[PDB]
Amino acid sequence: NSNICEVCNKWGRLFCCDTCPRSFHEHCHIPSVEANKNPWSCIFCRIKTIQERCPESQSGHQESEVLMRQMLPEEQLKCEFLLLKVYCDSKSCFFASEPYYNREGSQGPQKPMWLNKVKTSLNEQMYTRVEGFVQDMRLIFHNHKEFYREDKFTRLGIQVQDIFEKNFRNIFAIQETS
């Protein structure tokens, strides 16, 4: 097993996956590492299994159809993993906790959003469709771009959104296009 957290790349109190070499802090893993279960398989393993049970799940899909799917167990897991993949980028630190807005010449967003909030929303099963989760994720970056305007700090929003969008296309097997 690895000696660092797959998500935050730090050592500490780690839980090890039984079916692959990754390890996690308790609250770095999404969902949080389960109290019992021997053996335990992490979310990367659980996602690989879904693909292996249904190879045709990797054929191209239309984003519009993916967004209308109901948050049944497998969609729920895919959204948890996609959220996890955003947290794996160190730049996610800017978007994790509740932001505040006091900058000359800007007004704060009408609907603030942040990754920990989305994490809680997923945990409490507040999303009924994939669309709900994806809208909140995209809102995070859109609020950032609008607030920071021409400051070069807007680029952090672009960078982290690209990570989200690439992983969204991979996980939900969106049809490749030019």
Site residues for Zn ion per CB under 5 A: 5, 7-8, 17, 19-20, 25, 28, 42, 44-45, 54
Toward Zn ion, which CB reaches closer, 134 or 160? 160
Toward Zn ion, which CB reaches closer, 52 or 150? 52
Smallest gap from residue 95 Cβ to Zn ion (A): 16
Toward Zn ion, which CB reaches closer, 16 or 139? 16
Annotate 36-104 with DSSP letters as a single string. S-SS---HHHHHHHHHHH-GGGGS-B-HHHHHHSB--HHHHHHHHHHHHHHHTSGGGHHHHS------T
82 vs 46, 104, 146, CA distance in Å?
Answer: 13, 34, 24
Smallest gap from residue 32 Cβ to Zn ion (A): 12
Smallest gap from residue 55 Cβ to Zn ion (A): 7
